[PDB]
């Protein structure tokens, strides 16, 4: 089969600047008629792929004017002349010369923006959940950048480990920020053996760690 390799893997870029994603094919996609059978696609989070460029350089109908395709033979480039916040996503190249159709590994465009500290919120377990026999404690880190952030739980000033699950949203297509949830789940009996539940957050935009806590549950 034909092997498609893309470069870079991750491409951080600020809006207004250009971005170039490279696609390399193990076999020449140029035919004797002078055409290259290489296609580019965009997949935003949770959406179907969308055709951007076909036959190497032809922009598909409806694609924004800032997308262009270049190259020939074994090397091609998707060029975004002026990146915008909504360009965050994954871009794939696909060879259309031979069967089976093969795709590149994909390139994720990250939108660089100014540092933004997280807004931290803590939610105690609801009475309805406690009546079911368990207690989930949720700590929210909202709209921050860069993506890197750390969360440390404390139960009566006892550091917690390996009992918390994290989830991170994809980069917001508008403000280019991230959000993170950290969920500490315990049984009602265990939850009722301790009083103070705290969530400590560290982030680049924070001059010092921020903490949020609450009482009750004992």
């Amino acid at each position: 089969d034909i092997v498609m390799t893309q470069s870079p893997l991750s491409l951080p870029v600020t809006p207004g600047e250009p971005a170039s994603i490279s696609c390399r094919s193990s076999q020449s996609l140029l035919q004797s008629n002078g055409n290259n059978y290489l296609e580019w696609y965009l997949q935003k989070p949770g959406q179907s792929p969308q055709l951007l460029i076909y036959l190497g350089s032809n922009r598909a109908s409806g694609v924004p004017d800032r997308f262009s395709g270049s190259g020939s033979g074994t090397d091609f480039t998707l060029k975004i002349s002026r990146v915008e916040a909504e360009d965050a996503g994954v871009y794939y190249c696909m060879q259309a010369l031979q069967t089976p159709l093969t795709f590149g590994g994909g390139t994720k465009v990250e939108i660089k923006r100014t540092v933004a500290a997280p807004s931290v919120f803590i939610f105690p377990p609801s009475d309805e959940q406690l009546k079911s026999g368990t207690a989930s404690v949720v700590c929210l880190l909202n709209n921050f950048y860069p993506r890197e952030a750390k969360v440390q739980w404390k139960v009566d000033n006892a550091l917690q480990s390996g009992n918390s699950q994290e989830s991170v949203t994809e980069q917001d297509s508008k403000d280019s920020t991230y959000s993170l949830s950290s969920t500490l789940t315990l049984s009602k009996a265990d939850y009722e053996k301790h009083k103070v539940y705290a969530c400590e957050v560290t982030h680049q935009g924070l001059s010092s760690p921020v903490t949020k806590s609450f009482n009750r549950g004992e």
Binding site: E39, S48, Q50, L51, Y54, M94, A96, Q98, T99, P100
Partner: peptide
């Protein structure tokens, strides 16, 4: 000669 169809311009929601 075994070449695939080209230009997958429309995809469904999946």
């Amino acid at each position: 000669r075994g070449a695939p169809p080209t230009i997958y311009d429309h995809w469904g929601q999946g």
